[PDB]
Fold Polyethylene terephthalate hydrolase.
Amino acid sequence: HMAANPYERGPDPTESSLEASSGPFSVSQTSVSRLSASGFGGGTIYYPTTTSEGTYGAVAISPGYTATQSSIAWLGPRLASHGFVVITIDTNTTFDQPDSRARQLMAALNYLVNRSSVRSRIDSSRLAVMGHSMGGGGTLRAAEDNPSLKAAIPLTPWHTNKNWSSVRVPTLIIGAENDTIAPVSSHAKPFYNSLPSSTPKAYLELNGASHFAPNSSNTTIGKYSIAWLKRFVDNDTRYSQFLCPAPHDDSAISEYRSTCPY
Ligand code: NA
Ligand code: NA
């Protein structure tokens, strides 16, 4: 038999538990000021209250162009309530390009491990990155330049670079069908196609959604982000059951591609 996974947290998942507003863990918050944050413009840290089940993995989430922390803040308690330490960040300037946001994502993870007040609750060897729009472009660049990351979830990503053939981090790209700012035909889909065949990857296209779909509470985005982070940050195979959907059975999903090598 396969060895027991020590990174498993929370009870066995179901479809109703993943689509719920909150997970099985209570969440507390703490803030990081812009001036004390070295490399990024501060943010808020979301962490589970209880530690009796062991340490958790850390996730850094970046907003998009001319966007602040509040546009992605709903992912904070949504992801943390399932057993993750999440930091939503602000950028140094609201006009920072994707390559600049990639550096600020790793700087936020560096703060979580070395300087944050919740560093004792974090497993430093299991980190992930997320982002919306240009933050999603910075997510791809961070995963390419930091292969030690466990997962990466670009949300309607935007980037001038379409070549991501060196990304070794399991990447879940979530695109919007009617995206007019970062069209999937020139952004999300070329990003997914350029990812290596040996890298676990998936492309989720939201049916009839706009570019700002990730800026509000979304059941589809929340369920598959939890499943992806659980599957690769925690190696939790209990969440693999949620990663093989049929788009014709979900009105919120218009497309789904996925390749798993391991
Ligand atoms: Na700063
Ligand atoms: Na559908």
Remarks:
- The chain has six helices and nine strands.
